Ligand binder design. Structure first.
Ligand SMILES: CC(C)Cn1ncc2cc(Cc3ccc(F)cc3F)c(C(=O)NCCN(C)C)cc21
Ligand SMILES: Fc1ccc(-c2n[nH]cc2-c2ccncc2)cc1
Length: 337
């Protein structure tokens, strides 16, 4: 066991091993508190997240267990991974805090898009990496659910990583969630990617809606009201009525909306921003799209080992979720240096 040291940043107490030095806050919220730090054992700059009240309730305890399982499983260049997880506690009895460690990235995508407009080649490489990481995540039957510029981090090399999965198990959310459809599939993420790609090409949020209703009407204005094939798939009575009563609007021509953009980019957006989720393009299929010929390599777009999410359906006590989390802390194995 290593030796810990203690200090106060903002109003948070931080107890971490000596190897992590020069902690400086990065931000805080419901997710907990994040600090940038230097790892003397490896020489890397790292990001340390201290979970907030990890075992204060059953919802928190399960959430803590969920995040740790996910991060321990992700082993992919475009997905955030676990460098280390530790607790200052020496036993299950005193186990009360969990810290997570990962490589520090240069900036989030929301600090690039507004600082600069992106060339078509940059958009190619950035979107390509998101999809490469999404293919991996989706191969494990995991849905991110909250893909958005602030959840994508980039290095000065333009290397990208997907961060902070939505622990749910807004301008970027698929319309079937605005309609509250409880059976949305993994292509909800592909919709998010489409809204992101469009924003990089134009510099403007594609669907800057003020609420759920306003959001949907901005989406239908671009992709048009749903056809009869999609009408036949809606079970909700209120939804069906709301949609059949809206003044009908045609699908606009993306080539005209996105004038001057690479025609291969326009084509990909049209395959991503499809209202009917069954017809939306998949991450695996989008990687083979001609827009990414510069970067596509079918022997270097790997898939993930099978991920067991059976715990999601379990109804346990706080002490049981806590103990299961402790087990995952102890059995952690750092990645090969
Ligand atoms: C913006 C730069 C600091 C780039 N950067 N690089 C790595 C990294 C990790 C995090 C969060 C995080 C996740 C796993 C982990 F084990 C340790 C962690 F710290 C955050 C962050 O602060 N996320 C806040 C939550 N928001 C986005 C919803 C930011 C990160
Ligand atoms: F206006 C819309 C927008 C999106 C959808 C939709 N796309 N994929 C699945 C659905 C959907 C929505 C609600 N109920 C069932 C299915 C249906 C109508």
């Amino acid at each position: 066991r290593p030796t810990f040291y203690r200090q106060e940043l903002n109003k948070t107490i931080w107890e971490v091993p000596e190897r992590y030095q020069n902690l400086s806050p990065v931000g805080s919220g419901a997710y907990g508190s994040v600090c940038a730090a230097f790892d003397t054992k490896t020489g890397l700059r790292v990001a340390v997240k201290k979970l907030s009240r990890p075992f204060q309730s059953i919802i928190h305890a399960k959430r803590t267990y969920r995040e740790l399982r996910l991060l321990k499983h992700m082993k992919h260049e475009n997905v955030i991974g676990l460098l280390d997880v530790f607790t200052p506690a020496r036993s299950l009895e005193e186990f009360n805090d969990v810290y997570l460690v990962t490589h520090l990235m240069g900036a989030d995508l929301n600090n690039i898009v507004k600082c600069q407009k992106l060339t078509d080649d940059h958009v190619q490489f950035l979107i390509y990496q998101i999809l490469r990481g999404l293919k991996y995540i989706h191969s494990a039957d995991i849905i991110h659910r909250d893909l958005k510029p602030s959840n994508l981090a980039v290095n000065e090399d333009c290397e990208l990583k997907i961060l902070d999965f939505a622990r749910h198990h807004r301008w970027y959310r698929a319309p079937e969630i605005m309609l509250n459809w409880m059976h949305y599939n993994q292509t909800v993420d592909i919709w998010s990617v489409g809204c992101i790609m469009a924003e990089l090409l134009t510099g403007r949020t594609l669907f800057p809606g003020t609420d759920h209703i306003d959001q949907l009407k901005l989406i239908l204005r671009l992709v048009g009201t749903p056809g009869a094939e999609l009408l036949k798939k809606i079970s909700s009575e209120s939804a069906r009525n709301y949609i059949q009563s809206l003044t009908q609007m045609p699908k606009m021509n993306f080539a005209n909306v996105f004038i001057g953009a690479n025609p291969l980019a326009v084509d990909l957006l049209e395959k991503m921003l499809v209202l009917d989720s069954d017809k939306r393009i998949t991450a695996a299929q989008a990687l083979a799209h001609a827009y990414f010929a510069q970067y596509h390599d079918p022997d270097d777009e790997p898939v993930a080992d099978p991920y067991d999410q059976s715990f999601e359906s379990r109804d346990l006590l706080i002490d049981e979720w806590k103990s299961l989390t402790y087990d995952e802390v102890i059995s952690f194995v750092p990645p090969p240096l």
